[PDB]
Amino acid sequence: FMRREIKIEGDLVLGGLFPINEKGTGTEECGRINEDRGIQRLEAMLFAIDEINKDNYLLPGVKLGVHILDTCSRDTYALEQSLEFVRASLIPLLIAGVIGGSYSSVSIQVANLLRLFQIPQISYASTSAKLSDKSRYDYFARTVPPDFYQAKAMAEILRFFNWTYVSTVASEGDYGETGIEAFEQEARLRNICIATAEKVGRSNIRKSYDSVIRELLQKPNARVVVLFMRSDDSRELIAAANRVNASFTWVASDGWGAQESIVKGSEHVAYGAITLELASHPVRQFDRYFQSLNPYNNHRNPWFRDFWEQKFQCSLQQVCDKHLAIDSSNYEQESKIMFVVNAVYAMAHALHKMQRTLCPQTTKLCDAMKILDGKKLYKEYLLKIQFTAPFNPNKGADSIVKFDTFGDGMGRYNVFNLQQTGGKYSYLKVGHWAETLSLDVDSIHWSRNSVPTSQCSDPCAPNEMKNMQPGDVCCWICIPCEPYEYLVDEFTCMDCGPGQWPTADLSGCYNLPE
Amino acid sequence: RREIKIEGDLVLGGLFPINEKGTGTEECGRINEDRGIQRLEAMLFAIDEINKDNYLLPGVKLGVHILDTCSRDTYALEQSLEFVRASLIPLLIAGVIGGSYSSVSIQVANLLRLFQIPQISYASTSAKLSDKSRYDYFARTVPPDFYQAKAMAEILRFFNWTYVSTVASEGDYGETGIEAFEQEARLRNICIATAEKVGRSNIRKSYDSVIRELLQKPNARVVVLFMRSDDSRELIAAANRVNASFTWVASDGWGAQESIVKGSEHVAYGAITLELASHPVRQFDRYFQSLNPYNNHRNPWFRDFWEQKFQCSLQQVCDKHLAIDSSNYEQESKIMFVVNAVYAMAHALHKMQRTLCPQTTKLCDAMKILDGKKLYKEYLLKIQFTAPFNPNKGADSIVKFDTFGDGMGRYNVFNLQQTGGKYSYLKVGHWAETLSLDVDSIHWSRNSVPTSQCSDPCAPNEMKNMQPGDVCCWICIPCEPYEYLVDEFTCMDCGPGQWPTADLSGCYNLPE
Ligand SMILES: *[C@@H]1O[C@H](CO)[C@@H](O)[C@H](O)[C@H]1NC(C)=O
Ligand SMILES: *[C@@H]1O[C@H](CO)[C@@H](O)[C@H](O)[C@H]1NC(C)=O
Ligand SMILES: N[C@@H](CCC(=O)O)C(=O)O
Ligand SMILES: N[C@@H](CCC(=O)O)C(=O)O
């Protein structure tokens, strides 16, 4: 009966799309609140707009409004909601540009719609490589990189610890499939074999997941499982492994990232997991803003109440303590917030340079810009380069926001390790990827305190077996050697020669008596 | 804000260029009588018949939501939003019938695929639409211009017109259509004197400027046209002003439309045009001619249509006895395709209803929310005998689709004549896989089979043919009096004691 949205008027309006709510189960379209990647990212856009509307050097004279909608983590729903943005170009607010899409599937479908009406779009989290194709997504840009690189970071980590036999499980969609396709290619090149390639997807219940765990279990040697899955899917997969108490060493992409909500209730099954996330740094000023929010002062966000009640397990009108508050003990800035803020700022800077150009006499939205030329805006937005919203210290660690010729951001990632040292589970940065892998292996805590072994065949017996490679470079057979042969090396048996005999160790030959 | 909204258990959207493109600031202009109104009524006709048919969708009444595209892709696209807001007063759309201009069908297709809504065009011929990776919910009852271009090039190659000029409409129809021609041209050693093109928001001047430029290539007397209907009309009028005269070879955009040459009949005389191979739907003639402002209130565009066709007014008032009849009406060439497009959609839904609703003829719950993807990949396999409105079944009168969702590449060639004081299009041939036409029935511009070559033919008595750098133009070199033409391009000394024959084909001995 009621479909929520945020509508704030302005001289120029920016549309927004966030997975405020998780996907609905069964017949319902929306489910529980997505606390970190939903509410936080939403308020980070509101935070950016407020800051911009108080900035005298950026769009002074032009107030930015917004029209933020919920995607409910589903491309189809996001798509239906976005129709709201195009009808406006005919109560309805004219959309200068759209900020959003977290899931690549929604960003892509939304992009297919938006280009039809020349509406620029900037995503702050969609990493699918498909989105780099300017012949299909010509009005799309993003402040994050294409998984073309993330897939390399993952394959190079496996190649490092010599994990040549692994299983993979990808989410159906443009994120999981294209991302896993990239990995497979990077794997072949580095002689890494895939034991079993699984995949879950749309409208999947426990059984589809339990069925995946079972199939992973049918490849016991492949103890390292490469994941390229959506957040929600990852959560389901780990819950499935927790039931049958299965245990593997997970290598997950940003979809999983450094989210604690993913492993909650199955912390021991995900212990030792290694995950990736886009290299970013918290926006300090945002921490202050978000923590100051509460059901009393934050009425413009129609999802905040539901949020509040779920985060604290509340109720208003077990009632809730009017003294609750978001703080350093219960809140941690979502990993990609920086990208949301930069996205909004990039659109503002683009509009700002356009207004300086077409309206040389005032700071106001002059007649020449009453009807925006979206095509020009995009080909004015692509060439944008600016120092990251003030909320970023220094400027030496290349803190400039700009875009590739494909409209992408820079491929930089951080590697994380799920630890628990202090009784509580948390992610610890254990490395990073810029162009080459980098990580200090010593700070890594593994599953079962031993650096995993993930190879095709069982190791050869010492006392007499030689390692033999068939046709591939992942599997082998062990050939016991003749009692008179020793192991010159791991794969070769050689006759000790007359008068000599192999040592018990088989490392050499000793002289025979008698 | 006009439209046709008729409720039903299942609804089909429709798009037709009811109105011409608006000039300047206006979005819509005059009524498009044949390609707009007739085609629109043909869908209404088809829907009525299907609703009286006990063997096709019995128990499931088909309704419609028909909109005007005003011959513009952007306008059609905005209108089409109506079709998708529905899947959220608004009628849910099972499928869309339409797009005449390829540019509107393309843009509409990019929107419809996003909501898995199948679309069947009855006239959009662009080869682009065959790409199923881009237009995966699009199908059509007509073939791609990949073939039409071949038909045109082979016609030129036949009469040896190796030097021609081309003018194409800007847009997905003219540009891709002309590109295909150019390729087919090179392969048959046909050169393009000058490639012209008109387009969006073009006034007289742009066209006048094209005629001048065509005139700057006098040898190229044959001009190939791959233009929209409206653009063609503009180009012909322009030629009429400066009384220019060429032999036109136009694609179906022009087709067999008399409205294109009205007021410039003498300028287009002898023109050769193409149109998809089709036959009139007889039962449709009865239906259309029975329509009048008194009995046709469901078509909100009919009154304007009536007033323009008869130069009327209601409330020079109009004779209450006017009628659409055999002396002022002729079935539009593509009506058949419109009717078959609707029936194809109907047959697809019917098969789906038999499959998901095995126990009743009604739209059961299982089909409450249609799976458009399945529908499209259940419509592509459809094969049926053309709506009853087609005699025989031997002349392959079955409707079905390519793997690309296209129809069969069959065209007819027409010649604009005037023999009986009045101007008309006579069928002078056709193209199925190879060209075919009886050259004797063709009337040319200036009673002489046109000559369109780069250079003038060489004198016999002594000139040899010499090719410069290209393969279309040449110069003529007279031979020395003692040389003969071993062949068309080579003079050769008859040698001592000999001399060339009067005809220069050989050498004879000298006396004395
Ligand atoms: C990977 O294998 C190579 C070759 O056997 C070995 O030198 C290297 O130490 C291994 N890396 C690790 C840390 O397992
Ligand atoms: C040139 O065209 C004429 C007319 O159809 C035809 O009779 C003749 O054979 C053609 N000659 C060539 C070059 O093939
Ligand atoms: N990179 C993921 C989104 C992850 C996120 O929302 O943080 C995608 O492209 O679907
Ligand atoms: N074949 C033309 C349409 C001609 C017609 O409407 O009959 C096109 O694709 O633009």
Side-chain angles (χ1 to χ4, degrees), chain A residues 1-447 449-514, chain B residues 1-445 447-512:
Chain A
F1 187 58
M2 59 124 250
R3 194 214 67 191
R4 293 170 293 188
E5 52 164 50
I6 293 174
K7 271 189 173 178
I8 310 304
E9 309 202 311
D11 301 303
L12 248 33
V13 182
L14 295 191
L17 294 172
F18 303 86
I20 309 297
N21 285 279
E22 220 71 41
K23 172 182 174 185
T25 58
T27 65
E28 56 174 47
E29 296 179 291
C30 310
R32 302 178 67 263
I33 286 295
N34 187 344
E35 308 181 11
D36 290 41
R37 295 191 171 176
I39 286 296
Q40 262 197 72
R41 292 181 177 173
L42 182 180
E43 294 287 345
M45 177 162 170
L46 260 18
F47 165 72
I49 295 290
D50 284 344
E51 295 302 90
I52 297 173
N53 288 330
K54 291 170 198 167
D55 187 339
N56 305 303
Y57 306 81
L58 173 63
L59 250 23
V62 172
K63 190 194 177 187
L64 281 182
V66 302
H67 192 175
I68 304 179
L69 298 168
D70 197 326
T71 67
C72 291
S73 315
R74 298 200 298 169
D75 49 7
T76 56
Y77 192 85
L79 216 203
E80 332 280 307
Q81 296 281 285
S82 299
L83 245 9
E84 220 87 286
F85 300 146
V86 311
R87 294 174 189 168
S89 58
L90 278 55
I91 297 299
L93 300 163
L94 179 62
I95 311 302
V98 172
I99 295 295
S102 282
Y103 288 97
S104 288
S105 63
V106 342
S107 282
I108 291 168
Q109 285 296 70
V110 170
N112 287 330
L113 178 65
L114 261 22
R115 71 170 300 282
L116 273 14
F117 306 78
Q118 307 190 324
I119 297 181
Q121 175 195 349
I122 307 165
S123 176
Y124 49 71
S126 295
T127 57
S128 170
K130 284 186 169 180
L131 286 164
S132 297
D133 184 0
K134 303 304 83 174
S135 81
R136 287 181 182 279
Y137 312 103
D138 47 345
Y139 278 82
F140 177 94
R142 75 235 277 199
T143 46
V144 303
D147 287 324
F148 161 77
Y149 303 101
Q150 182 167 191
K152 294 192 170 193
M154 289 171 91
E156 284 188 353
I157 285 173
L158 297 199
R159 178 68 281 183
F160 180 77
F161 300 106
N162 301 313
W163 295 327
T164 299
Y165 193 65
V166 304
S167 281
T168 67
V169 10
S171 283
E172 289 182 56
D174 299 276
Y175 173 72
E177 295 174 69
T178 69
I180 229 306
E181 266 197 51
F183 174 71
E184 282 156 26
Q185 299 178 60
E186 294 303 319
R188 277 179 174 181
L189 304 184
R190 304 157 202 283
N191 295 309
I192 297 181
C193 294
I194 192 167
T196 187
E198 304 303 298
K199 68 180 187 179
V200 292
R202 295 181 174 181
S203 56
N204 276 49
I205 316 172
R206 283 191 165 184
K207 289 180 183 177
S208 287
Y209 286 79
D210 292 308
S211 163
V212 168
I213 299 299
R214 293 190 301 84
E215 304 200 62
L216 291 179
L217 292 170
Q218 289 181 290
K219 297 296 179 177
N221 286 318
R223 198 70 180 296
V224 162
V225 182
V226 174
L227 305 178
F228 220 113
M229 318 190 293
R230 294 164 48 102
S231 184
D232 46 16
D233 291 358
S234 299
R235 184 74 194 311
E236 290 270 33
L237 201 247
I238 289 301
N242 186 54
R243 304 202 203 77
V244 296
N245 193 186
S247 280
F248 308 73
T249 296
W250 316 97
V251 182
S253 57
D254 79 288
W256 177 325
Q259 302 187 78
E260 279 168 26
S261 63
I262 278 180
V263 181
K264 182 158 171 283
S266 313
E267 299 86 321
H268 69 94
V269 178
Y271 175 80
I274 286 184
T275 68
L276 288 196
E277 177 54 283
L278 307 179
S280 67
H281 309 69
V283 176
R284 271 304 204 68
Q285 211 171 308
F286 175 66
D287 282 317
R288 186 205 313 170
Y289 166 81
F290 195 58
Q291 294 181 327
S292 59
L293 302 178
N294 59 236
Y296 316 78
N297 60 20
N298 192 31
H299 289 303
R300 65 177 184 190
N301 176 347
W303 293 283
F304 206 61
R305 299 190 77 71
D306 292 356
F307 164 71
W308 197 264
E309 291 180 344
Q310 177 184 294
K311 173 182 171 64
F312 299 121
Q313 303 289 55
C314 283
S315 281
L316 299 312
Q317 280 292 297
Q318 181 192 306
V319 76
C320 256
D321 187 47
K322 306 171 188 176
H323 288 294
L324 265 319
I326 308 162
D327 61 60
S328 50
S329 80
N330 53 37
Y331 149 76
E332 185 185 301
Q333 184 161 137
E334 193 284 309
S335 178
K336 300 188 170 86
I337 290 297
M338 182 195 81
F339 298 108
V340 177
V341 172
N342 288 355
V344 179
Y345 267 75
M347 185 85 298
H349 271 280
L351 286 161
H352 176 86
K353 175 175 273 190
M354 178 176 259
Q355 105 67 59
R356 277 179 178 170
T357 303
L358 305 186
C359 304
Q361 301 187 293
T362 46
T363 57
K364 284 186 169 181
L365 211 295
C366 75
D367 301 321
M369 266 206 313
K370 240 73 172 184
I371 53 182
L372 287 187
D373 180 333
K375 184 166 184 169
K376 279 294 186 177
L377 177 55
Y378 186 76
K379 306 266 196 166
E380 165 130 37
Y381 171 49
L382 272 173
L383 309 184
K384 195 47 204 166
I385 296 190
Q386 101 265 353
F387 154 66
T388 300
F391 325 124
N392 181 290
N394 77 64
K395 305 180 185 182
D398 194 326
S399 47
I400 66 178
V401 323
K402 57 173 177 177
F403 310 91
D404 285 50
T405 48
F406 307 103
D408 305 315
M410 296 305 273
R412 315 298 197 68
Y413 313 79
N414 280 336
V415 193
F416 293 77
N417 188 187
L418 180 59
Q419 305 192 329
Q420 173 266 305
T421 69
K424 179 197 302 176
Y425 294 67
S426 300
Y427 295 87
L428 170 69
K429 179 184 176 179
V430 303
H432 58 279
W433 192 93
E435 197 174 312
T436 57
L437 177 55
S438 172
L439 68 177
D440 62 298
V441 188
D442 289 313
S443 54
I444 300 174
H445 285 22
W446 304 100
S447 179
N449 319 306
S450 180
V451 50
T453 294
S454 206
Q455 305 184 303
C456 182
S457 316
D458 300 58
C460 296
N463 292 296
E464 20 47 62
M465 318 217 287
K466 63 189 307 182
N467 193 298
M468 296 298 267
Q469 298 294 176
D472 51 296
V473 285
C474 302
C475 312
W476 67 86
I477 51 182
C478 299
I479 306 304
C481 301
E482 301 299 358
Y484 59 81
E485 296 182 308
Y486 77 107
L487 261 34
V488 174
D489 69 44
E490 195 178 8
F491 343 72
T492 316
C493 258
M494 194 179 279
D495 175 20
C496 268
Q500 303 192 87
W501 195 256
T503 62
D505 185 50
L506 261 83
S507 58
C509 303
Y510 71 87
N511 295 303
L512 286 175
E514 282 53 290
Chain B
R1 178 56 282 179
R2 283 183 294 199
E3 56 171 41
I4 298 186
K5 270 188 161 185
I6 313 302
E7 294 211 60
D9 304 293
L10 240 33
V11 183
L12 296 188
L15 297 171
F16 303 84
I18 304 310
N19 283 280
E20 220 66 57
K21 167 186 172 178
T23 51
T25 64
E26 56 177 52
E27 291 182 294
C28 310
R30 293 176 70 266
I31 291 281
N32 181 353
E33 312 179 23
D34 281 35
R35 293 196 173 173
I37 291 294
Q38 262 195 67
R39 294 185 174 172
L40 189 201
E41 286 296 341
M43 176 169 169
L44 256 21
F45 166 69
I47 293 291
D48 283 343
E49 296 296 324
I50 293 169
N51 287 325
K52 295 162 194 171
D53 190 331
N54 299 305
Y55 300 103
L56 174 58
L57 247 27
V60 171
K61 187 195 174 179
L62 281 188
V64 311
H65 191 177
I66 305 177
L67 301 170
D68 186 355
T69 66
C70 290
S71 310
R72 270 199 312 175
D73 56 6
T74 66
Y75 189 82
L77 192 230
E78 298 184 41
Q79 292 288 283
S80 299
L81 245 21
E82 232 77 288
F83 297 155
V84 301
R85 301 186 192 181
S87 56
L88 279 56
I89 289 295
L91 295 176
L92 183 69
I93 306 305
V96 168
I97 297 305
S100 275
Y101 289 94
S102 283
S103 61
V104 333
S105 288
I106 286 176
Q107 292 284 49
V108 173
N110 296 326
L111 168 69
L112 261 26
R113 68 180 294 274
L114 263 28
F115 305 78
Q116 312 193 328
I117 293 179
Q119 179 189 348
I120 312 172
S121 179
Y122 49 70
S124 301
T125 59
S126 174
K128 282 182 176 174
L129 291 163
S130 297
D131 184 355
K132 288 297 145 281
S133 83
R134 286 179 180 289
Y135 311 105
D136 47 348
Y137 279 78
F138 179 89
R140 73 228 279 203
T141 46
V142 303
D145 288 330
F146 161 74
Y147 304 90
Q148 191 170 183
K150 287 189 174 182
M152 298 171 85
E154 288 189 358
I155 294 175
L156 301 201
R157 183 60 275 179
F158 178 69
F159 299 100
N160 291 1
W161 297 325
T162 303
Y163 194 61
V164 311
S165 284
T166 67
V167 13
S169 284
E170 290 178 65
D172 306 276
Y173 172 77
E175 301 182 62
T176 71
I178 236 313
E179 278 185 58
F181 171 72
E182 285 159 21
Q183 294 175 52
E184 300 299 319
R186 282 180 176 177
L187 302 183
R188 293 153 212 280
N189 296 301
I190 293 170
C191 291
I192 278 188
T194 186
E196 306 300 295
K197 70 178 180 183
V198 296
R200 291 181 173 179
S201 57
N202 281 51
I203 319 85
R204 287 188 169 185
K205 291 189 178 183
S206 281
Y207 287 78
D208 288 303
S209 177
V210 171
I211 294 302
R212 294 192 297 85
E213 304 201 54
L214 284 184
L215 293 172
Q216 289 182 295
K217 299 294 181 176
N219 285 319
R221 198 68 182 300
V222 162
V223 185
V224 170
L225 299 185
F226 224 99
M227 315 190 290
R228 288 169 52 114
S229 178
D230 50 7
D231 296 353
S232 289
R233 181 71 193 308
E234 283 283 61
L235 202 256
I236 290 307
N240 184 59
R241 302 201 202 79
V242 302
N243 241 170
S245 289
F246 312 72
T247 293
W248 312 100
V249 179
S251 57
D252 79 295
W254 174 325
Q257 304 180 79
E258 282 172 34
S259 73
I260 281 177
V261 189
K262 178 188 179 190
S264 310
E265 296 82 324
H266 62 91
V267 179
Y269 174 72
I272 281 187
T273 71
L274 300 193
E275 180 51 280
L276 310 183
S278 62
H279 310 66
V281 172
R282 277 293 215 63
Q283 209 177 300
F284 177 74
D285 287 324
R286 184 209 307 176
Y287 171 76
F288 196 67
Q289 293 183 62
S290 87
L291 297 175
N292 58 235
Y294 319 90
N295 63 36
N296 192 20
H297 287 311
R298 70 180 179 183
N299 176 344
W301 294 278
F302 207 71
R303 295 183 72 82
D304 288 333
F305 162 73
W306 194 266
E307 292 180 350
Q308 179 183 300
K309 178 177 175 57
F310 305 104
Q311 311 277 54
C312 282
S313 282
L314 300 308
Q315 282 295 302
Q316 182 185 307
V317 65
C318 257
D319 194 322
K320 309 176 182 178
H321 290 293
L322 268 335
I324 300 170
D325 64 31
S326 55
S327 85
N328 56 40
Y329 155 79
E330 179 180 287
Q331 183 167 141
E332 190 277 313
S333 187
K334 297 195 176 78
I335 295 302
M336 181 184 91
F337 299 110
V338 173
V339 174
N340 295 348
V342 175
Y343 270 78
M345 188 80 265
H347 277 275
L349 288 160
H350 176 75
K351 177 167 304 183
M352 178 180 267
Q353 110 71 65
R354 281 164 169 182
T355 300
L356 299 176
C357 303
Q359 292 169 296
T360 50
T361 64
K362 289 174 178 180
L363 207 289
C364 68
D365 293 321
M367 249 202 315
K368 240 68 171 182
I369 48 183
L370 300 184
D371 179 325
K373 184 168 191 170
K374 240 73 169 62
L375 182 55
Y376 184 76
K377 315 265 193 176
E378 159 141 35
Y379 161 53
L380 279 179
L381 304 179
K382 194 53 208 175
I383 284 195
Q384 106 263 346
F385 157 67
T386 293
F389 327 128
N390 180 279
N392 80 67
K393 302 184 177 186
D396 195 315
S397 53
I398 63 183
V399 332
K400 53 171 181 178
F401 309 94
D402 260 60
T403 54
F404 308 101
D406 304 321
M408 299 301 269
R410 314 301 201 70
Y411 309 77
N412 281 327
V413 187
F414 294 80
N415 185 192
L416 184 61
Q417 309 186 319
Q418 174 270 321
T419 63
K422 175 194 301 181
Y423 291 71
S424 303
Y425 295 88
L426 172 74
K427 178 183 175 179
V428 302
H430 57 286
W431 193 89
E433 215 169 305
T434 56
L435 183 54
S436 178
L437 60 170
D438 58 301
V439 186
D440 296 312
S441 54
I442 303 181
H443 287 31
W444 302 101
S445 176
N447 292 305
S448 182
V449 55
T451 298
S452 207
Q453 300 175 305
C454 184
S455 307
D456 308 63
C458 295
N461 297 301
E462 20 55 74
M463 324 214 282
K464 68 193 296 175
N465 194 308
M466 293 299 264
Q467 303 293 173
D470 67 294
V471 303
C472 290
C473 309
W474 69 85
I475 59 177
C476 297
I477 303 303
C479 300
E480 299 294 344
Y482 52 83
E483 300 182 313
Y484 76 110
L485 275 40
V486 178
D487 72 49
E488 191 193 7
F489 340 72
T490 313
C491 298
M492 200 184 281
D493 189 11
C494 268
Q498 293 188 55
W499 189 265
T501 56
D503 93 73
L504 270 78
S505 77
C507 306
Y508 61 59
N509 289 307
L510 287 169
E512 273 62 290

